Design an enzyme around this catalytic site. Structure first.
Site, short mmCIF file in Angstrom:
data_model
loop_
_atom_site.label_atom_id
_atom_site.label_comp_id
_atom_site.label_asym_id
_atom_site.label_seq_id
_atom_site.Cartn_x
_atom_site.Cartn_y
_atom_site.Cartn_z
N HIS A 1 2.17 12.14 -2.57
CA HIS A 1 1.43 11.31 -1.60
C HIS A 1 2.37 10.44 -0.78
N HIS A 2 3.64 10.52 -1.15
CA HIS A 2 4.72 9.82 -0.50
C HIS A 2 5.36 10.73 0.53
N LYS B 1 -10.22 -1.23 -16.48
CA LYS B 1 -9.39 -2.34 -16.92
C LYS B 1 -9.77 -3.63 -16.21
N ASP C 1 12.81 -6.02 -37.18
CA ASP C 1 13.58 -5.85 -35.95
C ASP C 1 13.18 -4.51 -35.38
N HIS D 1 17.72 -5.51 -1.81
CA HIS D 1 16.53 -6.25 -2.20
C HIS D 1 15.71 -5.40 -3.15
N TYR E 1 4.32 2.61 -12.10
CA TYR E 1 3.39 2.33 -13.17
C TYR E 1 4.17 1.77 -14.34
N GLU F 1 7.57 5.47 -11.82
CA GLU F 1 8.31 4.22 -11.77
C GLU F 1 7.47 2.99 -11.43
N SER G 1 -3.89 -8.79 -20.44
CA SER G 1 -4.92 -8.62 -21.48
C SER G 1 -4.74 -9.72 -22.53
N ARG H 1 8.61 0.39 9.50
CA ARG H 1 9.39 -0.21 8.41
C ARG H 1 10.87 -0.01 8.69
N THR I 1 -8.20 2.48 -13.74
CA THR I 1 -7.76 1.14 -13.35
C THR I 1 -8.97 0.23 -13.22
N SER J 1 20.51 3.13 -19.62
CA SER J 1 20.06 1.91 -20.30
C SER J 1 18.57 1.99 -20.61
N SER J 2 17.75 2.28 -19.60
CA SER J 2 16.30 2.38 -19.82
C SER J 2 15.75 3.52 -20.71
N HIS K 1 7.09 7.79 -8.45
CA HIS K 1 5.76 7.24 -8.69
C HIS K 1 5.64 6.67 -10.11
N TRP L 1 15.81 2.14 -0.34
CA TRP L 1 15.89 2.29 -1.79
C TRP L 1 15.72 3.73 -2.24
C1 HEA Z 1 3.31 -1.78 -9.36
C2 HEA Z 1 3.26 -1.27 -8.13
C3 HEA Z 1 2.29 -0.32 -7.52
C4 HEA Z 1 1.08 0.08 -7.99
C5 HEA Z 1 0.41 -0.26 -9.31
C6 HEA Z 1 0.60 1.06 -7.02
C7 HEA Z 1 -0.64 1.64 -7.06
C8 HEA Z 1 -1.15 2.52 -6.12
N1 HEA Z 1 -0.50 2.94 -4.97
FE1 HEA Z 1 1.33 2.48 -4.38
N2 HEA Z 1 3.06 1.91 -3.73
C9 HEA Z 1 3.91 1.02 -4.30
C10 HEA Z 1 3.61 0.24 -5.41
C11 HEA Z 1 2.52 0.38 -6.25
N3 HEA Z 1 1.51 1.26 -5.97
C12 HEA Z 1 5.27 1.07 -3.68
C13 HEA Z 1 6.58 0.40 -4.16
C14 HEA Z 1 5.12 1.91 -2.62
C15 HEA Z 1 6.14 2.22 -1.56
C16 HEA Z 1 7.39 2.95 -1.95
C17 HEA Z 1 8.16 3.39 -0.76
O1 HEA Z 1 7.77 4.43 -0.16
O2 HEA Z 1 9.14 2.70 -0.42
C18 HEA Z 1 3.78 2.44 -2.66
C19 HEA Z 1 3.33 3.45 -1.78
C20 HEA Z 1 2.10 4.11 -1.84
C21 HEA Z 1 1.66 5.26 -1.04
C22 HEA Z 1 2.35 5.94 0.16
C23 HEA Z 1 2.47 5.13 1.47
C24 HEA Z 1 3.30 5.81 2.54
O3 HEA Z 1 4.55 5.59 2.59
O4 HEA Z 1 2.71 6.57 3.34
C25 HEA Z 1 0.48 5.57 -1.52
C26 HEA Z 1 -0.34 6.57 -1.08
O5 HEA Z 1 -1.00 7.24 -1.84
C27 HEA Z 1 0.12 4.61 -2.55
C28 HEA Z 1 -1.11 4.55 -3.25
C29 HEA Z 1 -1.38 3.82 -4.40
C30 HEA Z 1 -2.57 3.99 -5.20
C31 HEA Z 1 -3.70 4.95 -4.96
C32 HEA Z 1 -2.46 3.13 -6.26
C33 HEA Z 1 -3.48 2.85 -7.33
O6 HEA Z 1 -2.83 2.63 -8.60
C34 HEA Z 1 -4.40 1.66 -7.09
C35 HEA Z 1 -5.43 1.44 -8.19
C36 HEA Z 1 -6.15 0.11 -8.08
C37 HEA Z 1 -7.40 0.02 -7.64
C38 HEA Z 1 -8.07 1.22 -7.04
C39 HEA Z 1 -8.15 -1.27 -7.68
C40 HEA Z 1 -8.78 -1.59 -9.01
C41 HEA Z 1 -9.94 -0.64 -9.37
C42 HEA Z 1 -11.23 -0.88 -9.08
C43 HEA Z 1 -11.74 -2.24 -8.72
C44 HEA Z 1 -12.24 0.27 -9.19
C45 HEA Z 1 -13.21 0.45 -8.03
C46 HEA Z 1 -12.48 0.81 -6.75
C47 HEA Z 1 -12.62 1.94 -6.03
C48 HEA Z 1 -13.74 2.89 -6.35
C49 HEA Z 1 -11.63 2.29 -4.92
N4 HEA Z 1 1.16 3.77 -2.80
C1 HEA Z 2 9.72 -6.29 -7.75
C2 HEA Z 2 9.46 -5.90 -6.49
C3 HEA Z 2 9.67 -6.73 -5.24
C4 HEA Z 2 9.30 -8.02 -5.06
C5 HEA Z 2 8.78 -8.93 -6.17
C6 HEA Z 2 9.48 -8.35 -3.64
C7 HEA Z 2 9.42 -9.60 -3.10
C8 HEA Z 2 9.73 -9.86 -1.77
N1 HEA Z 2 10.00 -8.86 -0.79
FE1 HEA Z 2 10.18 -6.96 -0.98
N2 HEA Z 2 10.53 -5.05 -1.20
C9 HEA Z 2 10.62 -4.35 -2.39
C10 HEA Z 2 10.47 -4.93 -3.66
C11 HEA Z 2 10.11 -6.25 -3.94
N3 HEA Z 2 9.93 -7.22 -2.93
C12 HEA Z 2 10.85 -2.93 -2.17
C13 HEA Z 2 10.81 -1.82 -3.21
C14 HEA Z 2 10.98 -2.73 -0.83
C15 HEA Z 2 11.29 -1.39 -0.14
C16 HEA Z 2 12.71 -1.32 0.43
C17 HEA Z 2 12.91 -0.16 1.39
O1 HEA Z 2 12.18 -0.13 2.40
O2 HEA Z 2 13.79 0.70 1.12
C18 HEA Z 2 10.75 -4.05 -0.22
C19 HEA Z 2 10.76 -4.27 1.15
C20 HEA Z 2 10.55 -5.53 1.69
C21 HEA Z 2 10.31 -5.78 3.05
C22 HEA Z 2 10.29 -4.75 4.20
C23 HEA Z 2 11.60 -4.62 5.00
C24 HEA Z 2 11.54 -3.47 5.96
O3 HEA Z 2 11.04 -2.40 5.54
O4 HEA Z 2 11.96 -3.64 7.13
C25 HEA Z 2 10.17 -7.13 3.18
C26 HEA Z 2 9.99 -7.83 4.37
O5 HEA Z 2 9.30 -8.79 4.41
C27 HEA Z 2 10.27 -7.70 1.89
C28 HEA Z 2 10.12 -9.02 1.61
C29 HEA Z 2 9.95 -9.54 0.37
C30 HEA Z 2 9.64 -10.91 0.17
C31 HEA Z 2 9.40 -11.86 1.31
C32 HEA Z 2 9.53 -11.17 -1.14
C33 HEA Z 2 9.08 -12.44 -1.70
O6 HEA Z 2 7.71 -12.39 -2.14
C34 HEA Z 2 9.91 -12.89 -2.89
C35 HEA Z 2 9.28 -14.04 -3.63
C36 HEA Z 2 10.19 -14.35 -4.79
C37 HEA Z 2 9.86 -13.93 -6.02
C38 HEA Z 2 8.46 -13.55 -6.37
C39 HEA Z 2 10.87 -13.81 -7.14
C40 HEA Z 2 10.59 -14.98 -8.04
C41 HEA Z 2 10.52 -14.38 -9.40
C42 HEA Z 2 11.58 -14.51 -10.20
C43 HEA Z 2 12.86 -14.93 -9.60
C44 HEA Z 2 11.60 -14.32 -11.71
C45 HEA Z 2 12.13 -15.60 -12.36
C46 HEA Z 2 12.42 -15.34 -13.82
C47 HEA Z 2 11.81 -15.92 -14.87
C48 HEA Z 2 10.58 -16.78 -14.68
C49 HEA Z 2 12.30 -15.74 -16.28
N4 HEA Z 2 10.42 -6.72 0.94
CU CU Z 3 3.16 6.67 -5.44
#
Ligand code: HEA
Ligand code: HEA
Ligand code: CU
Ligand code: CU
Ligand code: CU
Ligand code: MG
Lengths: 109, 43, 47, 61, 49, 56, 227, 261, 514, 43
Positions: I290-291, I319, I91, I61, I244, I242, I255, I438, I316, I156-157, I240, I126
């Site tokens: 932080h992970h 924005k 292009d 997934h 962003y 990744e 935007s 989890r 953030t 590729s990327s 991480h 993952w």
């Molecule tokens: C696109 C996806 C995405 C984005 C953008 C972010 C953004 C952030 N994530 Fe992440 N995060 C994930 C996807 C993402 N994350 C994923 C995939 C994991 C789990 C991976 C794994 O372990 O499997 C994860 C896990 C994860 C962890 C670890 C959890 C754990 O396993 O213990 C942490 C801890 O620091 C964290 C923190 C944050 C923070 C601080 C931001 C910041 O970027 C947030 C910034 C946004 C705001 C803060 C809000 C907007 C701003 C304002 C309105 C300003 C005013 C607000 C304040 C003054 C607070 N994330």
């Molecule tokens: C892109 C990131 C992504 C997205 C979008 C989602 C979407 C979903 N994921 Fe998630 N999920 C992950 C990335 C993602 N997930 C990751 C990184 C983990 C961590 C794995 C790990 O623990 O190792 C995770 C883990 C995870 C868990 C935790 C399992 C566990 O730890 O035991 C669960 C359980 O509910 C879950 C559920 C779902 C569900 C219900 C959706 C639903 O919201 C899905 C809804 C469907 C969609 C939003 C897709 C539709 C969009 C398209 C098909 C695009 C179509 C194309 C065009 C329009 C051109 N996901």
């Molecule tokens: Cu992180």
């Protein structure tokens, strides 16, 4: 330009003058209105006047009507603004023979 | 040897491969009947 | 470039018949959604 | 069990009627083969009548 | 000239709104789903030895 | 040595409506087909191996 | 442990876990403030016929919205860091227990004096006695003295595992070849449940932790009858 | 329209990307066969189609630039950027390996003897051949520079002479390094020291070979008068890559061969 | 012909279309996998079986949605389609290489599919952390195949990252400065840089993992003196950036969408917006640990990483507030895309706010490895990254195709998906605060309510992605050709009509040097 | 954004068909495999 800002009276003047240019063409007439509408204000009757007269110079009745519609739209929820404008424009409206959107029935759907 | 090699000759070679390629396939078919590979039979 | 241009022509699949298209989209997205199900099945039938 | 008799009918009206309304929207089309088939009464008369009768009436002379 | 919504809007809204609530209430209650709500206030504790 | 880039420039600039990877003759063509053949076959062979390894 | 329909944290059995609840409340209060502020501004923006599509001067307001978030972050950071150090604090434990994660069970070792060591396995839901918790009961609870500073040392003998007990506010990964330390200190007797908090294979969900805290007296007699 | 009025290059449809993508499939899955079901046939085919692809893809690029003249100034500036960026991703690739090394050597686990180098490991002497390999690489740095300068000054013979000297030093290092491997009293399997050593110095080794075949290609392109005193990006790149290679060796030397031993 | 066009391409538009097609299909697979996950957790007990078959599903997934749906769509699809059009380029810089980037994807996907077929697949998560991913606890070809799939996807990327940076820097009109290119272009130019620097470290990490299990090395094996934690550092150093890399192109599309439907010429605070992404991109490189809060690191360093992670909120924030300021005096048009843009703004805020909570190491001790973190990232991914993809897709569909979508249907689709995702992920905040770990195929009886509600929401989402497929079909079945487009003065992509011709900007664009 | 009327309009019936089909193609295969889960789990 940068940092240089005008007082309201100047802003208005600048606009009245703009619309009064005798050799004003359709483009400049459209530009002027289309630009004026981007601001946060309903144009002063005196600016609207100059524009209505410019419409006459360009033998454009329809644009004169659309100009009045815009004035109303810009007032948003402020019901009292439009009538006051039409009031100050009454003379010109009659002199030029311009019908209000309400009179033409364009205010209905 | 050297005389035979040429820039110009390539179209003939390309043409030859197909006829040659077709010819090559026949031998496999011909050999296979005689060979009787169980795997070949399985195919 | 003998590459045709315009709506319905800048894509690798034919959009001329809506029902042939229906079939194609159905197999395309359909086979994609079914794959995980059949993989799980395959894993459940091993030993 | 009992619902099926109704739902099949409902499918009938929905499909036939939406189809019939779709006939109402310009766009000339030309018939598909299925149309020509089912509207030629299954072709059956036009083959089972022009054929055996010919072989017999010929044969009888 | 009335659009699809002028004529059907209310019909769809209502019938749709109705069907939804009907089917969900059933599934949520008429079948064997275990929601397992908090026993506090609903369950009377039995001695377990 | 030689220096005959001038001959090749001409050969490759020749308006024969050929894509650069073929603009150079017959060998370009055989190389192409060999490459293409090996790739497709290999890809087929790989799929077979995976189908084979999927099973216990 | 966790009860049906629970919303927040399990009740704090130890003081740092209490400390955490309060910090979370603080942090959560702020996320409620910001998240509701944004929602209000959004609906505000989308609710007027008045327009102003010409150019707007940025920067000016840009400071407010850059300095404010900066102050708020300190308001969270300070409390956070204090608790952080408070956890890694200079304390003197009166007991040292070791736990070793294994593929699908934990084993404990009390070896300060005598070499006491046992295995803790989950009780199959099939052989649970009425009133026993489905995927949480273990056969051999890890018995420890309430009201005392214990030093836990977590490690593993195979893949990674994570030893956690939420009520006490503990979680420490178990990495083979490593001895991670943590301070346990319950301020109340009872049974406290936890689960493996790290993916470790087929039975990752079936290798729980159950702490049973009794007074010293009963702790030592238990310890002896255990060998 | 019809006739373009921008200085860019619209490349003709090539089958090579498909061919090289398929190649990657074949080599990766082929390694999986070698590693698991003990077979290389697949790995062999992949290595083959891969060379075929690179040869052709680069042959065309030469055709399009030297024979067809598509490499206008704007097109070239873009190639420079591409190379720089590529070298960058490479610099970060090697960084994973120095991270690994330093991680291990700075905090030696008890299973090693709680020291570095781990007990039982007999490190090579930096002052022996490692010192030689260092001077060889460094000298090819000065000779490739001489080559570059002759080229810009239109000195055909000298550019050829310097490019030749450079190439042989690169080969000399390869052989020398090869023997070191064979005489080394430790292996990939000798714990973290061997891992850390053989994969870092090993990947670098692969890079010296990749850089040498590149300079060789440049050599022949020159024999054929491809390069002009002013347009020779193929050489500029070969040169940049070659320097990246000395530099990586300098870090290897100092870190693994000297400090961590 | 078809071959030459579709297999031997050198056209940014066609390669971009090829991506969107690959991403949509991969999106189906990922959706199916997410449903098996909630199917398994929707009733107390085991449906599939042990955490192995279950975690194999959870792993695929993640890989599928991250590497095969989100990245291909946003960067390869919209990236290739729109970038050249927005800067007036004929292009890309390397048309051929660009094609390899695409064609490396299907094989990469095959290797990943193959991994779950042979043996018992890869039930590693993952993050594919060792010792579980090692040749003892996970013997067999599976993990190796998972690793090779990742190698290709990475090659590729970074090849594409090289193309976008070169194009974007080197192929704009001579009079146009970088501070004159649109936010989306900036958004992908910055994302491209993150890929260039993070992807190689990952490849260094998994190559070390590959040798550890086939060549007898011990990089992560204590026996030889290795360290399982070393893998965590390498992985997360990429891990991480990744995420962003996953949200940045989304920030850009947002935007563009917000500005367009607000009837504005440009977004509020353009340079603040450029500064924000640049800051986000940079801080994103110094916070990986932080992970690893519960791994046993020094309190001091643990303190550094919580602080460093928190300052990302500032940029953030500028924005979020800028997009709001953009809506300000606007003449709002309640189009489907605008609906997706608004949802993103809120939902992404909530999900990132929730991430600030996890930023705290102390609190993260009890929050790590629980469903709270599953909620955090699904909010920012399912209603952040994905909402941007949908808004961008419905907004630009006419440009790509020449045909229009049925707006009403398109709005129905938003309504359904908005309900679905919230119902799915909202409850999960509780399950996590209350302790549900989890990667579990089953849970203690107490977690039954929320897990049930959660799974029901996933079925509504299923309904929505089914409807979307139809919505695309109908668009193509009806054939309403585009006539007029608004605000083209400020939106170059539309100036060549829908769809733009195979060859655009054959004769450049005229831009004065004031 | 304006557009010409559909060159080939899709009447409600036509939509109802495409919608039904689209659903079945997703729901059937999965339903089948899911319907027989137990058989697999028991060989
Ligand atoms: C696109 C996806 C995405 C984005 C953008 C972010 C953004 C952030 N994530 Fe992440 N995060 C994930 C996807 C993402 N994350 C994923 C995939 C994991 C789990 C991976 C794994 O372990 O499997 C994860 C896990 C994860 C962890 C670890 C959890 C754990 O396993 O213990 C942490 C801890 O620091 C964290 C923190 C944050 C923070 C601080 C931001 C910041 O970027 C947030 C910034 C946004 C705001 C803060 C809000 C907007 C701003 C304002 C309105 C300003 C005013 C607000 C304040 C003054 C607070 N994330
Ligand atoms: C892109 C990131 C992504 C997205 C979008 C989602 C979407 C979903 N994921 Fe998630 N999920 C992950 C990335 C993602 N997930 C990751 C990184 C983990 C961590 C794995 C790990 O623990 O190792 C995770 C883990 C995870 C868990 C935790 C399992 C566990 O730890 O035991 C669960 C359980 O509910 C879950 C559920 C779902 C569900 C219900 C959706 C639903 O919201 C899905 C809804 C469907 C969609 C939003 C897709 C539709 C969009 C398209 C098909 C695009 C179509 C194309 C065009 C329009 C051109 N996901
Ligand atoms: Cu992180
Ligand atoms: Cu475990
Ligand atoms: Cu576990
Ligand atoms: Mg963990």
């Amino acid at each position: 330009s940068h940092g240089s800002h005008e007082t309201d009276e100047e802003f208005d003047a600048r606009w009245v003058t703009y619309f009064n240019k005798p050799d004003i063409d359709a483009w400049e007439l459209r530009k002027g209105m289309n630009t004026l509408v981007g601001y946060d204000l309903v144009p002063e009757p005196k600016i609207i006047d100059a524009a209505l007269r410019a419409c006459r110079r360009l033998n454009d009745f329809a644009s004169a009507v659309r100009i009045l519609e815009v004035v109303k739209d810009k007032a948003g929820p402020h019901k009292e603004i439009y009538p006051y404008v039409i009031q100050e424009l009454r003379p010109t409206l009659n002199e030029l023979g311009i019908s209000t959107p309400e009179e033409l029935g364009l205010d209905k759907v | 040897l050297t005389r035979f090699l040429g820039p110009r000759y390539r179209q003939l070679a390309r043409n030859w491969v197909p006829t040659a390629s077709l010819w090559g396939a026949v031998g496999a078919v011909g050999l296979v009947w005689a060979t009787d590979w169980r795997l070949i039979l399985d195919w | 470039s003998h590459y045709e241009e315009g709506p319905g022509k800048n894509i690798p699949f034919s959009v001329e018949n809506k029902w042939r298209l229906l079939a194609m989209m159905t197999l395309f997205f359909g086979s994609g959604f079914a794959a995980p199900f059949f993989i799980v099945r395959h894993q459940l039938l091993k030993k | 069990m009992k619902m099926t008799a109704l739902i099949v009918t409902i499918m009938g009206f929905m499909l036939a009627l939406e189809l019939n309304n779709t006939t109402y929207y310009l766009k000339f089309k030309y018939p598909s083969q299925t149309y020509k088939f089912s509207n030629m009464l299954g072709y059956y008369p036009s083959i089972m009548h022009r054929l055996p009768t010919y072989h017999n009436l010929s044969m009888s002379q | 000239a009335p659009d699809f919504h002028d004529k059907y809007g209310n019909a769809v809204l209502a019938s749709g709104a109705t069907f939804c609530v009907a089917v969900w209430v059933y599934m949520a209650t008429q079948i064997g789903i275990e929601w397992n709500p908090s026993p506090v206030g609903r369950v009377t504790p039995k001695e377990w030895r | 040595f030689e220096n005959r880039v001038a001959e090749k420039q001409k050969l490759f600039q020749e308006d024969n409506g050929l894509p650069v990877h073929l603009k150079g003759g017959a060998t370009d063509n055989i190389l192409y087909r060999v490459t293409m053949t090996l790739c497709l076959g290999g890809t087929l062979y790989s799929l077979y191996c995976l189908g084979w390894a999927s099973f216990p | 442990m966790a009860y049906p329909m629970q919303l927040g944290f399990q009740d704090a059995t130890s003081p740092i876990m209490e400390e955490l609840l309060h910090f979370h409340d603080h942090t959560l209060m702020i996320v409620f403030l910001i998240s509701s502020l944004v929602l209000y501004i959004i609906s505000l923006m989308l609710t007027t016929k008045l327009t102003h599509t010409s150019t707007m001067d940025a920067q000016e307001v840009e400071t407010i919205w850059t300095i404010l978030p900066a102050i708020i972050l300190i308001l969270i950071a300070l409390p956070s860091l204090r608790i952080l150090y408070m956890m890694d604090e200079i304390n003197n434990p009166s007991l040292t227990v070791k736990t070793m994660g294994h593929q699908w069970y934990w084993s404990y070792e009390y070896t300060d004096y005598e070499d006491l060591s046992f295995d803790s396995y989950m009780i199959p839901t099939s052989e649970l006695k009425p009133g026993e918790l489905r995927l949480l009961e273990v056969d051999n609870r890890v018995v420890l003295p309430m009201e005392m500073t214990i030093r836990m040392l977590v490690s593993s003998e195979d893949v990674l595992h994570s030893w956690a007990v939420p009520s006490l506010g503990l979680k420490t990964d178990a990495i083979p070849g490593r001895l991670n330390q943590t301070t346990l200190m319950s301020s109340r007797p009872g049974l406290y449940y936890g689960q493996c908090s790290e993916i470790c294979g087929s039975n990752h969900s079936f290798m729980p932790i159950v702490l049973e805290l009794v007074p010293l007296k009963y702790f030592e007699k238990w310890s002896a009858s255990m060998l | 329209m019809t006739h373009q009025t921008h200085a860019y290059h619209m490349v003709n449809p090539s089958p090579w990307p498909l061919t090289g993508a398929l190649s990657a499939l074949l080599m990766t899955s082929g390694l999986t066969m070698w590693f698991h079901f003990n077979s290389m046939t697949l790995l062999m085919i992949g290595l083959t189609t891969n060379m075929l692809t690179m040869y052709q893809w680069w042959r065309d690029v030469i055709r399009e630039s030297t024979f067809q003249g598509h490499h206008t100034p704007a097109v070239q500036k873009g190639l420079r950027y591409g190379m720089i960026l590529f070298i960058i991703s490479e610099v970060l690739f090697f960084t994973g390996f120095f991270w690994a090394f330093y991680h291990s050597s700075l905090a030696p686990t008890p299973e090693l003897g709680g020291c570095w180098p781990p007990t039982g490991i007999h490190p090579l002497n930096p002052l022996e051949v490692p010192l030689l390999n260092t001077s060889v690489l460094l000298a090819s740095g000065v000779s490739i520079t001489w080559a570059h300068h002759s080229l810009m000054e239109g000195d055909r013979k000298h550019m050829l002479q310097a490019l030749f000297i450079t190439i042989t030093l690169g080969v000399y290092f390869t052989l020398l390094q090869a023997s070191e491997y064979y005489e080394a009293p430790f292996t990939i399997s000798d714990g973290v020291y061997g891992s850390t050593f053989f994969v870092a110095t090993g990947f670098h080794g692969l890079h010296v070979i990749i850089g040498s075949t590149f300079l060789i290609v440049c050599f022949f392109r020159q024999l054929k008068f491809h390069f002009t005193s002013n347009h020779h990006f193929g050489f500029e790149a070969g040169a940049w890559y070659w320097h990246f290679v000395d530099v990586v060796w300098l870090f290897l030397y100092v870190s693994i061969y000297w400090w961590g031993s | 012909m078809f071959i030459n066009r579709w297999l031997f391409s050198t056209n940014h538009k066609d390669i971009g279309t090829l991506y969107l097609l690959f991403g949509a299909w991969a999106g189906m697979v990922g959706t199916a996998l997410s449903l098996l996950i909630r199917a398994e957790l929707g009733q107390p007990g085991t449906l599939l079986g042990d955490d192995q078959i279950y975690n194999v599903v959870v792993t695929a997934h993640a890989f599928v949605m991250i590497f095969f749906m989100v990245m291909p769509i946003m960067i390869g699809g919209f990236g290739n389609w729109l970038v050249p059009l927005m800067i007036g380029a004929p292009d890309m810089a390397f048309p051929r290489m660009n094609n390899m980037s695409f064609w490396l994807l299907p094989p990469s996907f095959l290797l990943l599919l193959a991994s779950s077929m042979v043996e018992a697949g890869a039930g590693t998560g993952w993050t594919v952390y060792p010792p579980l991913a090692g040749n003892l606890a996970h013997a067999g070809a599976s993990v190796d195949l998972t690793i090779f799939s990742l190698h290709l996807a990475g090659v590729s990327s970074i090849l594409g990252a090289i193309n976008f940076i070169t194009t974007i820097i080197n192929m704009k009109p001579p009079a146009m400065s970088q501070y004159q290119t649109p936010l989306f272009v900036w958004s992908v130019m910055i994302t491209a840089v993150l890929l260039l620097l993070s992807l190689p470290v990952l490849a260094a990490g998994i190559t070390m993992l590959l040798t550890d299990r086939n060549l007898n090395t011990t990089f992560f094996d204590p026996a030889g003196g290795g360290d399982p934690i070393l893998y965590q550092h390498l992985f997360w150093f990429f891990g991480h950036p990744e995420v962003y890399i996953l949200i940045l192109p989304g920030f850009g599309m947002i935007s563009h969408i917000v500005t367009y439907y607000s009837g504005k010429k440009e977004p509020f605070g353009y340079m603040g917006m450029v500064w924000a992404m640049m800051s986000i991109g940079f801080l994103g490189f110094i916070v990986w640990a932080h992970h690893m809060f519960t791994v046993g690191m020094d309190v001091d360093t643990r303190a550094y990483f919580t602080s460093a992670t928190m300052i990302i909120a500032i940029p953030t924030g500028v924005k979020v507030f800028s997009w709001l300021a953009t809506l300000h005096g606007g003449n709002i048009k309640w189009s489907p895309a605008m609906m997706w843009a608004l949802g993103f703004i809120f939902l992404f805020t909530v999900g990132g706010l929730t991430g600030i909570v996890l930023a705290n190491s102390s609190l993260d001790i009890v929050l790590h490895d629980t469903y709270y973190v599953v909620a955090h990232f699904h909010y920012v991914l399912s209603m952040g990254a994905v909402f941007a993809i949908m808004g961008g897709f419905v907004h630009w569909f006419p440009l790509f195709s020449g045909y229009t979508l049925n707006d009403t249907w398109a709005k129905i689709h938003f309504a359904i998906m908005f309900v679905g995702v919230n119902m799915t992920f909202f409850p999960q905040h509780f399950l996590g605060l209350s302790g549900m770990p989890r990667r579990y195929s089953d849970y203690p009886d107490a977690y039954t309510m929320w897990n049930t509600i959660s799974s029901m929401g996933s079925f509504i989402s299923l309904t929505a992605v089914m409807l979307m497929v139809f919505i695309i079909w109908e668009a193509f079945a009806s054939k309403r050709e585009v006539l007029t487009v608004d605000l083209t003065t400020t939106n170059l992509e539309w100036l060549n009509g829908c769809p733009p011709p195979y060859h655009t900007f054959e004769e450049p664009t005229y831009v004065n040097l004031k | 954004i304006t557009a010409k009327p559909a060159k080939t309009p899709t009447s409600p019936k036509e939509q109802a068909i495409g919608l039904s089909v689209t659903f079945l193609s997703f729901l059937l295969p999965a339903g089948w495999v899911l319907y027989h889960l137990d058989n697999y789990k028991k060989s």
